[PDB]
């Protein structure tokens, strides 16, 4: 109940200062020739940092308004990182540049709304040009090539594994089991996947890396609300009695049974796994039937003839292995009878022949076929020690994430060359009607080149001359740019440098939106 | 026990400063071309705000007197929002303008009482002129049109649903049940409605959105005071035993049974629903008989032959679904026998033929017929996911609220055009007797145009020229004004912009009253 | 070369503070029941003050802007005192009131120009009403009456002398010669008068009282420029030789001869009297011929046959007595031959019979006849001692000044009653077109009553009740007012209290003009 | 205070009431409209008990407070 107000230019200047400070701190690690950061933990001794996400998330300025701007920039950076996985620094730099130019133009008396419309139109033109010029990733050979360069090149076994896993399946997953002294052998296994993590962050002890500790785990299927311990206590008690893993599917559970069990005896007696049930009511029933067919064969519902208080291990489902983390669940090696599964599949196929089938049901069953017939692509990572297998697992996960982004969207020459080419060959065609729209187009044209300037300046060479050579001398050649690793103007396609279209496009879109929003806030309040 | 006093001009200036600061902060979001606000939560990371109610409620100034003025303005703004649902920013701006002009005139030595009388008479003339010039909303086609434009236009299915629900019933309600994968199908169901929320805010877990979790819930009917657990414990215990919802109707209950149950076992075992009994003693008996006829068939009263300690599920009433929130209760799908309901209805109809029936009883039974025969208009909202169905429900609720306001009062050209036309064609006829009344009339004439000026200035164009063109060039045409979305002088009726008469009228009335009251307070005290 | 600037409201408030402080200091002596002021001289010991002019001229505030406003008010007060001789305090109070109301209305957003026009029109209406209602002073009996009351009544011999001097002549003059043990006997003597004082303030030793020390003084007549000592040294040398007074008439003289004489021997050897020649070239020649005819008979001009270097006492003019002070010259007892004067007068009279005479020459000679045939009215004041004759001379001079003002303009009931009657019966008829003109009219109506309020409050009685009784109960009777001397509502005409129309009218006009000018100065600069 | 609260000058109103209408007890000033009308017909009233006890208590309290040279307070 205590606030202070800043109006118009003062608040905008405070937000400018905060955003500029955070972006200047973050951009120091931009490009292959980045520079390190010094971070200290609360306990122990300080660590080192060379990326951008952690330093961006670990910044809090002196002034409250600067902290507010930094926290908003952290929000958009974290959203971009979760969506794509990289490009956070470039998005932050672009947002800072656009916001600074916008506030500078606003201080001159220009209309913020026309500026916002102009920058929006220019950003749309830029992304359209980028999509037009991009290249697709289809052939298995170039699939292996992009997997190799996305995995620093030395990971030849990793790129072969990724190419095989892409040519076999499309969903894909990575898991680790104990030492795993094998040589990273791949396999194809039927399974299911959905994106619904645990409601509470206390259900996984190894939440830092999401370790796999569910070997042949039992599962529970339910649809109605679970809010009492009357009909769920026997299941967990018997699971602890036989020392077997189990999961709980409840629409909304406050963990009263978990708290009672913990107070009776602290953690170390059972594995609690609570996952909220999905939506799509009819599709929810269909997916429940599908998972029962794969593993369980029996669901729990008071409307159905099955009694709600029949919680016994007789009809409980099982699977070869499961993997549930904070954002999605991985199911594989269904234990159901394959004969009945094939019979139901052929029944569905025969149902596909009826022209009178409902369109929504038809498409739901078609996507069910698409996500079930293919199977879950599982790769057993290898290694010698626990730390070695862990670092191999993380390397594999970033490599596969980059590969998925590249295949679903497309690759572009990295290092900011694509941005320069787009800003030079795209915005020259736009013809804004009024004057402030032209000013905003010029603002976006000047701000697009900022990440490339930072990348070039990080190595040491002057960015102005490099940008002039790239934009003018090599305007026709899209792939021609500057290789900061060696300092020679070579094509990133042959050199191996790349940037997927998805990450750069979403970073540019989020940066432009955040800057446009921040440039139109006269009033901003903070707490005491 | 510690206060400081400010007398006359000093306190009035402090209140002026506080009100002006709050209104300047709020008005930044006025009009379609509004500008955003930066709000940070206590935990987590800051959010964004583009409306006026939240920023108005989340402002607390430095000085105690400024905070006092801001809190009074928050009171009137919240009352206006609860009464209408919008127009908070316009009311705040009008109140600030009127208060500033009033205090400026008071500092010149004018009589505050004559100024208040003059502004009251001028406001009465303005609202009378607005009511005279308005248009009615009767035809189903223009009903669908106003529903469409009130729902941003793109909600075509929503406007069709609203038109059907208005042509079928007049009470109306919106409810959500789980995913609701349907296509937003409407229905007609008999039910009852009253406005009496829960006494305590702890009875609903999802108080943020008032979720519906009462499927076939049992209900309890009582009239006498309930203050002991002797005759209410068996009901709640058996309801928890069979896991069925239940409600409690008590004149005044302190929740001793609820506290005992919670301390025996914290929340998660029963659903407490306590609603205070209404007034209108004889009408209360009539409404109790009506709800019993619809659902229960038996009421509880020591005066009646029914025993007070007969709390068994044998005669407890039931319904298909119920919806009770913090301001009103929704009852629908009565489970009583329709044959006896029809027999009692025909008995009442025959009783209507007696000329000797009491007038109060006749009108009470007539309004009972009006609110019972029509039925409760219920619409089953649709959607794919939980967040999608939630946003659809909120969109529907604001659309229906605006539609109800428009039909019960009438629509006017939005964007402040109606205010300009009223101030130009209305106050010129008034002929105040003394001089300070004329000064107050001039004050209200100058202050009415403030919301339009803010709306025009928010986009960027100069407000003075736009107001001059609207007031003088297009004085005859009421619908002619300024469209801030595009900048062309077009009619809001064809363009779709509107403002219901109810919201603008109540905002103007509350603003004028608050400003007149605040302009006549020499003394104002604050705590330490 | 060092200034500080104050803009708009700040400078206006500073001027308000200065003017209000000076006016509050001055008004303490307003009315017959005034209150004294304490003034200290640079040397010696402090004196006492009960008037307004000296305290107004001896005020300098702390702030530079307050001093600037006080100095402007001193300018207008001194101009009013020089024009009329009294009413300075009333004019200052009226100016303060009008300026305060004007700035208060300006702070409310009213248009200063419309306010100025309204107050100008209202002031014109007020003065027109005052002129309409006034009474003329014609009959010799009421002439003696007004002379008596203007001279505090006890001066019966003075009022008889004034009545005789008014019935005999119209120019009038007062002179003192040594003790003058006579009984204040009057006489009629031919003479001349003009308003042109000495160029330098060092020519009169007794400049405090303008003592008469020119008994039978020689005079010099000249028309051409005098800038060298070649043709003026013999005259002053011979005048000092015979110890006779002399005068010098030069268009522009820097006093080089005076400085040379002083450095040869400091003051105490000659009487320097330098008076600038008048304008009106042809009329200047006519007046030179007239003064020569009366006294000299010979003028000096190079164009005329008279030699410029003929400065001898042979043809120098002489008179019985002369009186020259810092503002006008008094000539009397011409020494020329009366026979030739009569011959020239009859020649002029015969010239009046020619219809072909020039109109300008005709009117110049007619006014010459009017100011020559009548003669200069000279009164020989009486007394016992030097201080007694001095105080008698000052008493006579103020009495005659008041009498001249009254006869040339007219008398009105003093004590502010006339202002109240004018403000009540005059401004009610005016119908201003716009609104700010009405506001200015109300401002002048409220400000006119300020001198009466101060007069009543000085005695001790409440001014509000007295003003209410005067304005309402006695609206019809112009002469009815309040007598602050005794506290009874009696007519000032019978009671003897009066205020001439000229003084009050010019004070009101100057106050209104100064306030209107001061209310429209946003910018005002002061030195370091 | 009553007259000044409305806005009109209290001095003139009190002078008119005390002097012009001294004989008429009911004649006074109606602050609601500003016209000198009788409160008996206008409806305005004040019971004798309340005004008498208020005057008595005010006079007693003022007289008591005017004769206290010494007065102590806590920390």
PDB file of N, CA, C and O in Angstrom, chain C residues 462 464 469 473, chain D residues 9 11 16 20:
ATOM      1  N   UNK C 462     -17.730  48.233  12.646  1.00  0.00           N
ATOM      2  CA  UNK C 462     -17.683  47.241  11.578  1.00  0.00           C
ATOM      3  C   UNK C 462     -18.110  47.881  10.262  1.00  0.00           C
ATOM      4  O   UNK C 462     -19.144  48.553  10.196  1.00  0.00           O
ATOM      5  N   UNK C 464     -18.921  46.307   7.384  1.00  0.00           N
ATOM      6  CA  UNK C 464     -19.921  45.569   6.619  1.00  0.00           C
ATOM      7  C   UNK C 464     -21.327  46.080   6.908  1.00  0.00           C
ATOM      8  O   UNK C 464     -22.110  46.336   5.985  1.00  0.00           O
ATOM      9  N   UNK C 469     -26.101  49.260   5.429  1.00  0.00           N
ATOM     10  CA  UNK C 469     -27.103  50.275   5.736  1.00  0.00           C
ATOM     11  C   UNK C 469     -27.079  51.406   4.715  1.00  0.00           C
ATOM     12  O   UNK C 469     -28.135  51.906   4.309  1.00  0.00           O
ATOM     13  N   UNK C 473     -30.558  50.757   2.757  1.00  0.00           N
ATOM     14  CA  UNK C 473     -31.572  51.565   3.427  1.00  0.00           C
ATOM     15  C   UNK C 473     -31.644  52.972   2.844  1.00  0.00           C
ATOM     16  O   UNK C 473     -32.735  53.540   2.718  1.00  0.00           O
TER      17      UNK C 473
ATOM     18  N   UNK D   9     -22.504  37.354   4.224  1.00  0.00           N
ATOM     19  CA  UNK D   9     -21.771  37.986   5.314  1.00  0.00           C
ATOM     20  C   UNK D   9     -22.596  37.923   6.594  1.00  0.00           C
ATOM     21  O   UNK D   9     -23.780  38.274   6.597  1.00  0.00           O
ATOM     22  N   UNK D  11     -22.061  39.625   9.464  1.00  0.00           N
ATOM     23  CA  UNK D  11     -22.185  40.880  10.197  1.00  0.00           C
ATOM     24  C   UNK D  11     -23.472  41.611   9.830  1.00  0.00           C
ATOM     25  O   UNK D  11     -24.216  42.059  10.710  1.00  0.00           O
ATOM     26  N   UNK D  16     -29.053  43.205  11.014  1.00  0.00           N
ATOM     27  CA  UNK D  16     -30.459  43.300  10.638  1.00  0.00           C
ATOM     28  C   UNK D  16     -31.351  42.569  11.634  1.00  0.00           C
ATOM     29  O   UNK D  16     -32.435  43.057  11.978  1.00  0.00           O
ATOM     30  N   UNK D  20     -33.206  45.678  13.438  1.00  0.00           N
ATOM     31  CA  UNK D  20     -34.446  45.908  12.704  1.00  0.00           C
ATOM     32  C   UNK D  20     -35.589  45.062  13.252  1.00  0.00           C
ATOM     33  O   UNK D  20     -36.734  45.525  13.314  1.00  0.00           O
TER      34      UNK D  20
END
